[PDB]
Amino acid sequence: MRSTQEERFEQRIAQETAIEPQDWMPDAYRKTLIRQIGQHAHSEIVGMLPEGNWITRAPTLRRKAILLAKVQDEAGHGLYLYSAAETLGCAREDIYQKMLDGRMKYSSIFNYPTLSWADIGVIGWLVDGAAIVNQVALCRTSYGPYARAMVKICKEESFHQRQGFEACMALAQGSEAQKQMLQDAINRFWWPALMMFGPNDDNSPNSARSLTWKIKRFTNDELRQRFVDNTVPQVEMLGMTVPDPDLHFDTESGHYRFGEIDWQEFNEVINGRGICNQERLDAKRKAWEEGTWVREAALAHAQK
Amino acid sequence: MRSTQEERFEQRIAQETAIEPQDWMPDAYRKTLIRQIGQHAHSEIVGMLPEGNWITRAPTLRRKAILLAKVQDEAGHGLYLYSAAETLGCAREDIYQKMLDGRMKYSSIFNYPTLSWADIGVIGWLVDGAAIVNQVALCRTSYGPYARAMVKICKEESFHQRQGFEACMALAQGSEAQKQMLQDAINRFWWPALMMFGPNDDNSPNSARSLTWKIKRFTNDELRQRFVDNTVPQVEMLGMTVPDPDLHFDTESGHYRFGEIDWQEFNEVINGRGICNQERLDAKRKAWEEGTWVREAALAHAQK
Amino acid sequence: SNQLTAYTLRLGDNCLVLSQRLGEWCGHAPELEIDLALANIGLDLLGQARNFLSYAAELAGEGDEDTLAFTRDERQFSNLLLVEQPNGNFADTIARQYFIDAWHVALFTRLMESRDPQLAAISAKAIKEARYHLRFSRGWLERLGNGTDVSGQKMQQAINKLWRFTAELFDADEIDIALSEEGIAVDPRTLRAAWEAEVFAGINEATLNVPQEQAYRTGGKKGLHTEHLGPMLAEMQYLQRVLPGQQW
Amino acid sequence: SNQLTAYTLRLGDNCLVLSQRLGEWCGHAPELEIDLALANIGLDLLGQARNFLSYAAELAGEGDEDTLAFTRDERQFSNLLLVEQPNGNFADTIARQYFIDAWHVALFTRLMESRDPQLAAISAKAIKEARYHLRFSRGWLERLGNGTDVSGQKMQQAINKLWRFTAELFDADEIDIALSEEGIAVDPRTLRAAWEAEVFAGINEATLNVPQEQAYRTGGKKGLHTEHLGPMLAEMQYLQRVLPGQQW
Ligand SMILES: C[C@H](O)CC(=O)SCCNC(=O)CCNC(=O)[C@H](O)C(C)(C)COP(=O)(O)OP(=O)(O)OC[C@H]1O[C@@H](n2cnc3c(N)ncnc32)[C@H](O)[C@@H]1OP(=O)(O)O
Numbered sequence A, B: 001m002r003s004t005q006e007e008r009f010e011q012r013i014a015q016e017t018a019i020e021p022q023d024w025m026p027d028a029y030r031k032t033l034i035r036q037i038g039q040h041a042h043s044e045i046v047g048m049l050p051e052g053n054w055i056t057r058a059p060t061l062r063r064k065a066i067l068l069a070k071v072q073d074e075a076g077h078g079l080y081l082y083s084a085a086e087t088l089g090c091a092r093e094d095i096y097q098k099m100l101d102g103r104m105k106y107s108s109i110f111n112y113p114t115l116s117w118a119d120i121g122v123i124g125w126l127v128d129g130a131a132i133v134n135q136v137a138l139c140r141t142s143y144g145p146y147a148r149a150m151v152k153i154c155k156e157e158s159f160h161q162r163q164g165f166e167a168c169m170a171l172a173q174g175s176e177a178q179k180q181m182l183q184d185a186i187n188r189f190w191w192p193a194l195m196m197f198g199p200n201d202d203n204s205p206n207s208a209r210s211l212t213w214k215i216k217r218f219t220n221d222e223l224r225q226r227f228v229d230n231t232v233p234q235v236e237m238l239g240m241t242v243p244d245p246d247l248h249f250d251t252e253s254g255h256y257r258f259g260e261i262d263w264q265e266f267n268e269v270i271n272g273r274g275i276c277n278q279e280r281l282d283a284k285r286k287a288w289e290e291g292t293w294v295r296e297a298a299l300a301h302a303q304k
Numbered sequence C, D: 001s002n003q004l005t006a007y008t009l010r011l012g013d014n015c016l017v018l019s020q021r022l023g024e025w026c027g028h029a030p031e032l033e034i035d036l037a038l039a040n041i042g043l044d045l046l047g048q049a050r051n052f053l054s055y056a057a058e059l060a061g062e063g064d065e066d067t068l069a070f071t072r073d074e075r076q077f078s079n080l081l082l083v084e085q086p087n088g089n090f091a092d093t094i095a096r097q098y099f100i101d102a103w104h105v106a107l108f109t110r111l112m113e114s115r116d117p118q119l120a121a122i123s124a125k126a127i128k129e130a131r132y133h134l135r136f137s138r139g140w141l142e143r144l145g146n147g148t149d150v151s152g153q154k155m156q157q158a159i160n161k162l163w164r165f166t167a168e169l170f171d172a173d174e175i176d177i178a179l180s181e182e183g184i185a186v187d188p189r190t191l192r193a194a195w196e197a198e199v200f201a202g203i204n205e206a207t208l209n210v211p212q213e214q215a216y217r218t219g220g221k222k223g224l225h226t227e228h229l230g231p232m233l234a235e236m237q238y239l240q241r242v243l244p245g246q247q248w
């Protein structure tokens, strides 16, 4: 027998009654959301670095301004997610430190280097496109503060994703060198974007509870399939290709069937052994440590 | 009446008998040479910075290699001059610290910025050309260790000065943009090179004693005149101009007569208020301070 | 027209170059809130640069903001020496920002009374942003100067290190004077009182000292820069230099 | 020929990029003697780069060392990830130099037995220089590692920070293997024993620890670089990009 608290909770979830910070919740529900919302907020922060890498090198003042606005928004979104996570009883300073220590994760996609300007448009288009599918799906997540933060975030992000696509369209319609730049960026970011959705439904330890508690509204595989179906026509609009010999339309199912993800790479990356993991965390650790005297100054000034 | 020590010294100087570290010398002679040789050695060190500024940006691998060899030689020359200065009873570490503190000088010319690649060829050609006239004139300076260090230095430098001229010849024979680059570098470095020779013979407090003691073998003005007579034909070989409306050949005297130097600027520069003075000393102070743990490591290792 | 073009370009270059420096901070700030703030300031300044540069191109009858930003070399750039200084530590960045925002406030306040309509309009937009910037930079001057012993020392040093470049803020050349006599430009010499009233008070409030060194460094406006600008331009312009004449 | 060209280019790129990093130290060293030493090493490595790149151009039938150095982008550069790492503090620079010189010694020793005469000849020159470099870098490893507490810590950290990039020193691809089976190239996997014999002993002698992290970073040879290379190339290539096709 469930307790009455436990039973009432399951009934709230079934009737789509949003959970609020003052409501009883299973301790495992509280903790999985501190985990997921906290790592969502970590991802906003780390994601500033591969894009920031190109702010000073962007080829036009227009593209530079668009990119600065995007990165400024990412920072704001990190703040919204930390606020939401804090309603669950955690402290931002504490979970941020766990991120610095590699005790909490951030999105796998941010461990990949920006090796060309096309990578920036591709991040704006494919990477932000994948985050949008995942994040719109979370606008009906069961925890209210999280759902409402997703609404606000999604309203802002989809504009930037459109600007990313337009930057890619400029390359797609430009010189042969620009077209090759775009293709090469796609070749390097396509599979990493697919991995943003998470492991297969067979290999997803959090899915059972997250699905039951309506934290997760669609499976990792479902969201990834929708992303592929939505994005393949955009690749075609650019006159570009997908680095997947097994991608094909299956009229039987009405879906694009696509090839197997490299799960060995996925597991290397999420565990700190991807291309830029060390650099990303070094950079944030350096910013934290070197900024210490500044934070201590602000605190000491406030008190006076 | 001079003392017998004083009289014997004057007789040694008159007969061109080189003074050696164990010989008696007037205390004012010892000190003016610690001053001049020490600041000569300081100049080698500081002069690495405007040229070093372009090592990573040089337009060809050949020009980059030539420039690295030059800068490596400058370092070696600094070492020779510190050794020579130390024979007079001073300590390198001590006079280097006075340089860091702005208590000793280094050549005015090194306070000017390298704003283009042409500046590098112009430093190789005009600046090194001026140092060569001055330094060859010092191969017969009265103090032996100094004279012998000048011989060694001059043998090495004149090769690099020839390479500087050849880099300028490439620009002079190249595209219109390259020619304009060269002219602009000349316009900015011509007068500063003239100032390397020192103040006018009327405004030179050290000249009286230096000339009498055969430290200085030619007056500042004499050396500067020779430099102008020798260099003007080289400017013509490049098809370039001199930024001096008053420069003209005077058949009466057999010399090029040239315009008035800006002595107000000269005095600003030698007193720390030129274009790059602060940057040059900041850079050497930073290298000294940040290198401290390295020097302390070497000392502690030697002792074990 | 040549004078007006050069004057407009100077103001654009000041904002462009300072925007570049701020962009380097992205992801490296002491707090997420500061990262947000610096990206915001850099974005405003970039917007101002686009406005001034666009007008400069229109005045010249050729090119655009991108030809101006990406195809000029360091000897053609006309920004103040102050805005090309390295970021350094956070106090070095705050000092540079405060000196510039105080100047922008003084300048744009008066430039919105320009007898050139486009310059007046550009300035009327920029002053609103400059006011925000000044609150931020002055706020941080006070927090650092009057924070800890450590932060107080770093802030003093930051101020001392940058002081010599403030001379150029009130340097007037024939372009400045000629345009000012036509009621088009502000004569920078007449900005000193207002800038000093702001900056002297701010430093005092922060419990710091006004440097006694007489400021002496100029040349940025004439394309005579420190050794910092060339490397900034190499980074900024690389792609455009590699793949010229394209759309992005 | 395509394989031989790419192999030669890798060796050239390793030296070119490391030479660039050393050039940044000029005038900034802890001692005048060190400034001298780093300029010397950077000059040797640049000489080696010119040799390898020249041969690469000759093999390809077009261009020269300058077209190769200044007109390729970061995705075409094939240097090891190790040589593009930032200078950092003096220990970071010593660690990177020591790992590379130990590898160069092992490699050039065997590459002077290449069945390709030009590669053998280039290697016979380079090995003499690499031996000098190794004495210098190993000497400084010992002085720092076995110096003070402070220097010992910095040297350990420098070693730890760079370790993950050592995997690429013994990474073999189809170019390596195919050319090695023809007796032209050295199979990098067979360099491990010699490199480890040198480096393990050197670290031990310096009173330091061999990092326990399993090295895992590769990709430089395939044009898949860290975010450090792009900015290095912007600086290196700027003038050539601005004024292409000229003589200097
Ligand atoms: C700033 C960016 O725009 C942020 C984005 O929107 S990126 C798009 C994906 N969305 C997010 O990252 C934010 C919201 N999070 C989620 O939807 C989910 O956490 C998720 C789909 C990423 C993973 O599902 P979840 O049920 O939490 O984990 P599960 O499927 O069991 O995966 C197993 C482990 O791998 C982690 N993981 C899965 N995919 C990952 C990825 N792409 N990167 C890093 N870690 C990942 C999980 O968090 C989990 O580890 P943990 O228990 O230590 O947290």
Ligand SMILES: C[C@H](O)CC(=O)SCCNC(=O)CCNC(=O)[C@H](O)C(C)(C)COP(=O)(O)OP(=O)(O)OC[C@H]1O[C@@H](n2cnc3c(N)ncnc32)[C@H](O)[C@@H]1OP(=O)(O)O
Pocket: B035, B036, B039, B040, B043, B044, B047, B105, B106, B107, B108, B109, B130, B131, B132, B134, B135, B195, B196, B197, B198, B199, B203, B204, B205, B206, B207, B210, B216, B220, B270
């Ligand atoms: C590394 C470079 O290649 C070095 C060079 O060779 S540059 C070419 C000039 N040569 C040198 O600097 C090295 C040898 N020195 C000299 O020949 C002389 O010191 C000199 C010709 C520079 C000056 O003459 P000297 O009799 O010493 O001084 P004097 O003519 O009275 O000048 C008055 C003051 O200005 C200094 N001065 C003169 N010219 C200077 C210059 N171009 N830069 C900096 N200081 C200068 C003098 O040293 C002196 O100050 P001090 O008493 O504090 O040292």
